[PDB]
Amino acid sequence: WTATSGSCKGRCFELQEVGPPDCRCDNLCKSYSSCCHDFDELCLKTARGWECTKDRCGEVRNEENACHCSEDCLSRGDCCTNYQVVCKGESHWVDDDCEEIKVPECPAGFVRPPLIIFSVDGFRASYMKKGSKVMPNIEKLRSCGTHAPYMRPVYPTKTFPNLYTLATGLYPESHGIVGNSMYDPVFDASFHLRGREKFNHRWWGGQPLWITATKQGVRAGTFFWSVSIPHERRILTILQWLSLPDNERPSVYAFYSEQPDFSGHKYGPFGPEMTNPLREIDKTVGQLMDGLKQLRLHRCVNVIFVGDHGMEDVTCDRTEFLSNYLTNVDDITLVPGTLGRIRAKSINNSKYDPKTIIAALTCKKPDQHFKPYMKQHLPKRLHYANNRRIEDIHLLVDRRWHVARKPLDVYKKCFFQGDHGFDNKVNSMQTVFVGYGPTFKYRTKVPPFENIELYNVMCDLLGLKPAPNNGTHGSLNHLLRTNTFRPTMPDEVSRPNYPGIMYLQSEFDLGCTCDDNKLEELNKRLHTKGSTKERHLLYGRPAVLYRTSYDILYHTDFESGYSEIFLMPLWTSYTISKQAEVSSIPEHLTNCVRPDVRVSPGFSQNCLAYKNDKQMSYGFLFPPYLSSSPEAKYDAFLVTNMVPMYPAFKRVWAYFQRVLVKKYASERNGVNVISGPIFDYNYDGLRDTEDEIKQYVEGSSIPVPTHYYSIITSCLDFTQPADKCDGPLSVSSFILPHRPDNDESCNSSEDESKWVEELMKMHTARVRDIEHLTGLDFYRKTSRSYSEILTLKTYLHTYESE
Ligand SMILES: *[C@@H]1O[C@H](CO)[C@@H](O[C@@H]2O[C@H](CO)[C@@H](O[C@@H]3O[C@H](CO[C@H]4O[C@H](CO)[C@@H](O)[C@H](O[C@H]5O[C@H](CO)[C@@H](O)[C@H](O)[C@@H]5O[C@H]5O[C@H](CO)[C@@H](O)[C@H](O)[C@@H]5O)[C@@H]4O)[C@@H](O)[C@H](O[C@H]4O[C@H](CO)[C@@H](O)[C@H](O)[C@@H]4O[C@H]4O[C@H](CO)[C@@H](O)[C@H](O)[C@@H]4O)[C@@H]3O)[C@H](O)[C@H]2NC(C)=O)[C@H](O)[C@H]1NC(C)=O
Ligand SMILES: Cn1c(COc2ccc(C#N)cc2NC(=O)C(C)(C)C)n[nH]c1=O
Ligand SMILES: [Ca+2]
Ligand SMILES: [Cl-]
Ligand code: NA
Ligand code: NA
Ligand SMILES: [Zn+2]
């Protein structure tokens, strides 16, 4: 109950919210049906429209008007945005040449340049080129400021998850807004776009920018605008707040537009009806810039023009129905659309089985337009598993398609021609970023980057210390003229041991067998001391950022950091030049495993456990196929280069090592490779401690990895070989799930040349993703600046076309 009979007189768009049942005058009041009786009359004036005209110039103030053209309007901060143009012979901001903004040019009393976040719903990255003729104000921001060709959203590519990721720097799994619709089993409550539950504070985790600002004494304007408050009034309100006295004036502001998303749903991303919404958005930007100019703030404010996600062509006939796959369809609840999430309709049903549901949805029709996953098997790059609000069963839906439970759900609930929500690598889901102002660079294009990075930068722009988040602070320093954040490399926690020859062959009882000169002996000793290490370890050894016990092992063809706790390498590093040759494993060495006389039997794996374990086989991290000489090849069969592998996974790994590494070396002019195991049994994206491992090679203490990574680095200028590169680097990486079957790949009964590389592309990763998962820190010794290295570590190779 609200006693909605107070008044909004003097209080219009009040920045502090009043405690009910006192009536409200803020933007949220509409959403609560709690506005004072006179809110519309006083706060939403519309009389005479939105622009000054010739005959309105110098008028006598009439407080009923939507905006003013009187002489005193500037001092009041309530002129229509085109006032100076029409009445004082000024030019529109868009018609002025751009001029570098080298320093902030602000009115006296401004302690820092204000930040304005101009957020646009459904604004697809390609609209910047394709709509350029009809968006002159936006094209001026873009060409005169700092811009990316596109910005990567988070998964799922829905509105609330992405906007709250912008605000917090967090993945949806950590902030808690994991979809547009959600069930939380602990609260036993549901969250929906329509309705009241979404206003409850318990849904919203992390610390958004407006709270970060307030806690540190920086004032914030509203981030939320009621849908019925027209766009012209939102702009005028911001311009009014910027006229407040120094002690009352916010330093950060947000504008939001429901377009072009609203129209894109109805007409598709490029429908002829889409031109008008893009024109209208551009006119709004023009109004802000004209308004800032009148206030002498157009060379003072930093403006961010940013989208939440793009928009794809999707129609009703492109729907798959779970009723075409499942017999028990009424015993499940589906969260439907451009992704799928499945749980049991009733917790009292103990005959519901997720295994048989997954199997009934796996590779059943020749062109099936979704793929089922247990959430922990989703590509790690999506970071979409560590939340109780994310159902165990997930469906990744092909772009252009929907999934629904039964046909009745579609025709009893074609309307739409566009939708979004798909995998965040998809080109149609990419969105926009432009920064313009004294703190951003002038006429600068930067590479594409992820929206999780922006919170840190908005904190930098406002002099705030960011709350802990998933950005990599410093990776976006190249966007900025000043206010850069100067990070230091993390300190190494554990130093390695460097073991020499300490054990005789006969001390090993591992059940392993193998069929195995003064010039050529001084040679082998130097290799084991690290003589070729400069060739195989190009960027320094990785630093271990947790407490553990490990050894560095040198060899002719590779170097490794070998964990005495996990009984295998944490990392193995090797360089393959363009000229390198592939050989095979000779017949007499097919099942050869050799004890490592630098490492105790007690800290070694054993062959008998693999013989005993009927499900589990083994592979090698440095591939024997790529040995430099028949004698160097013996090093590759050391028990210290061995790792546990399911036979189904060995098909993948063997093709990567035998075919793909040489292919990359030919195409990239040499590559440096770092490979290793990952253990993430609790699917939190972070390295497991040893007490978290759920599976071992039968009857041993050899832990089974959940994934295998590789990081593949070369020269960005590919006329220079990987091992002699003078400038910036180029990287691609992956995190392959270590699975006992290939059910994920529907063509896997075919030759590896038809499906393996496609699997690897799906599981593409950032170096930073691997760092979180292993507790290692890479690229410690290069000739490059640390900020440049941080940008490299956040890079994702997506394999999408242009
Ligand atoms: C992306 O960036 C984020 C942010 O940096 C990273 O997430 C952090 O990860 C930290 C390490 O896992 C984690 O630290 C833990 O914090 C626990 C206290 O958490 C509360 O306080 C914080 C700070 O204010 C708050 O943010 C948290 O909010 C979470 O929980 C509520 C829901 O209840 C949500 O509203 C909110 O959205 C958020 O949820 C997310 O995080 C939780 C985990 O915290 C997930 O479960 C959710 O799914 C969701 O993803 C909390 O309100 C603290 O209790 C922990 O301490 C335990 O572990 C330590 C190890 O050091 C041990 O020594 C202690 O004994 C203790 O263990 C005890 O509890 C165990 C479990 O009950 C029990 O088994 C033991 O026996 C012990 O009794 C721990 O320090 C931090 O909370 C989050 N922060 C956020 C915002 O998510 C994230 O890792 C990054 N991702 C990647 C891939 O890099
Ligand atoms: C969506 N929306 C808005 C604008 O909301 C925003 C604009 C910019 C940022 C940032 N950074 C964040 C939000 N919102 C959020 O983060 C939510 C998820 C709490 C709503 N007004 N009206 C309306 O429907
Ligand atoms: Ca983990
Ligand atoms: Cl959703
Ligand atoms: Na076996
Ligand atoms: Na298969
Ligand atoms: Zn939408």
UniProtKB/Swiss-Prot annotation:
Domain SMB: 4-47, 48-92
Domain writeup: The nuclease-like domain is most probably catalytically inactive as residues that are essential for catalysis in the DNA/RNA non-specific endonucleases are not conserved. However, it is required for the stability of the protein and the catalytic activity born by the Phosphodiesterase domain.
Protein's UniProt keywords contain Transferase: no
Residue span of motif Cell attachment site: 76-78
Tissue/organ expression: Abundantly expressed in cerebrum and cerebellum. Localized in secretory epithelial cells in the brain and the eye including choroid plexus epithelial cells, ciliary epithelial cells, iris pigment epithelial cells, and retinal pigment cells.
Effect of D121N: Abolishes lysophospholipase D activity
Location relative to the cell: Secreted
Binding site for 1-tetradecanoyl-sn-glycerol 3-phosphate: T159, N180, D261, H420
GO CC annotation: extracellular space; membrane
Residues annotated as site: Essential for catalytic activity: K793
UniProt main location, coarse: secreted
Family: Belongs to the nucleotide pyrophosphatase/phosphodiesterase family.
UniProt activity-regulation remark: Inhibited by vanadate. Inhibited by micromolar levels of bile salts, such as tauroursodeoxycholate. Not inhibited by taurodeoxycholate. Not inhibited by hydroxysterols, such as 7-hydroxycholesterol, testosterone, dexamethasone and prednisolone. Inhibited by EDTA and EGTA.
Keywords from the named record: Calcium, Chemotaxis, Cleavage on pair of basic residues, Disulfide bond, Glycoprotein, Hydrolase, Lipid degradation, Lipid metabolism, Metal-binding, Obesity, Repeat, Secreted, Signal, Zinc
Binding of Ca(2+), residues: D680, N682, D684, L686, D688
Cofactor(s) for this UniProt protein: Zn(2+); Ca(2+)
The protein's role, per its UniProt record: Secreted lysophospholipase D that hydrolyzes lysophospholipids to produce the signaling molecule lysophosphatidic acid (LPA) in extracellular fluids. Its major substrate is lysophosphatidylcholine. Can also act on sphingosylphosphorylcholine producing sphingosine-1-phosphate, a modulator of cell motility. Can hydrolyze, in vitro, bis-pNPP, to some extent pNP-TMP, and barely ATP. Involved in several motility-related processes such as angiogenesis and neurite outgrowth. Acts as an angiogenic factor by stimulating migration of smooth muscle cells and microtubule formation.
Enzyme class: hydrolase
The protein's name in its UniProt record: Autotaxin
Glycosylated sites: A3, N348, A360, N470, N747
BP term (GO), one: positive regulation of oligodendrocyte differentiation
Cofactor binding notes: Binds 2 Zn(2+) ions per subunit.
Positions of Zn(2+) 2 binding: D261, H265, H420
Region named Nuclease-like domain: 538-802
GO MF: alkylglycerophosphoethanolamine phosphodiesterase activity; calcium ion binding; lysophospholipase activity; nucleic acid binding; phosphodiesterase I activity; phospholipase D activity; polysaccharide binding; scavenger receptor activity
Required for secretion as annotated region, ranges: 770-791
